[PDB]
A paper describes a structure:
Within this class of proteins, the bromodomain and extraterminal domain (BET) family contains four members that are transcriptional coregulators and that recognize acetyllysines (AcKs) using a tandem pair of highly homologous bromodomains (BDs). Despite heavy academic and industry investment in this area, the generation of paralog-selective inhibitors has proved elusive because of the extremely high sequence similarity between the bromodomains of family members (90 to 95% within the acetyllysine-binding pocket residues). Using the highly conserved BET BDs as a model system, we conducted three mRNA display-based RaPID (random nonstandard peptides integrated discovery) screens using a single library (which contains >1012 unique members). Crystal structures of 13 distinct peptide–bromodomain complexes revealed highly diverse structures and binding modes among the cyclic peptide ligands.
Numbering used by the authors:
A (entry chain K): 1 to 11
B (entry chain A): 351 to 454
C (entry chain C): 351 to 451
The structure:
Amino acid sequence: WKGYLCLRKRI
Amino acid sequence: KHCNGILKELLSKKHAAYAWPFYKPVDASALGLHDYHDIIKHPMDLSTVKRKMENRDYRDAQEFAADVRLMFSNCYKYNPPDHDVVAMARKLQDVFEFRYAKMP
Amino acid sequence: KHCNGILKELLSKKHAAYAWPFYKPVDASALGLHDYHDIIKHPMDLSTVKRKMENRDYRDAQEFAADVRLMFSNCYKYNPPDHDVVAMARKLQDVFEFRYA
């Protein structure tokens, strides 16, 4: 919900 | 039992580089993916498999493998084939299908 | 005690719209936060500041202010610059930095 890794989960 | 060792391997730090998209249920609100629950009818992650292992929810090893692949299948169904999570899903599934095949 | 008023103000309802990401320690067990402790080596939140004040850990106002800024520093370091939480940290830090000033 707020990290740099979790941007990879975005389409 | 032998599935519990498989579950430790998928949750092990060795594969944490590509297994992290599945550590927790998909938060469709935080990732900008509101249509996720319109497309995915049966979500699955490793924290859910782990909870169903400690509670003994799997009758045999096949039910275990069914939930793990569903977690990969949802990624193949929802994400585009060139998406980063699909590359991480292929690699983590490759790890799973090996440890699951070489059981007694 | 000049710091206790600063702590209650940041924890009051007046700033609850943007102060809620800092009420509790960052839960690194969330979906994509498994790397927080690999990147941030000194976590900090407001529940620890209150617990370090009730246990009376801060000697002077320079020890209190050091922890508060580290909590904002971790937010700027870990999160992308265009994320809402850094904007929430920027908004809340202005409230802190000028009660301490």
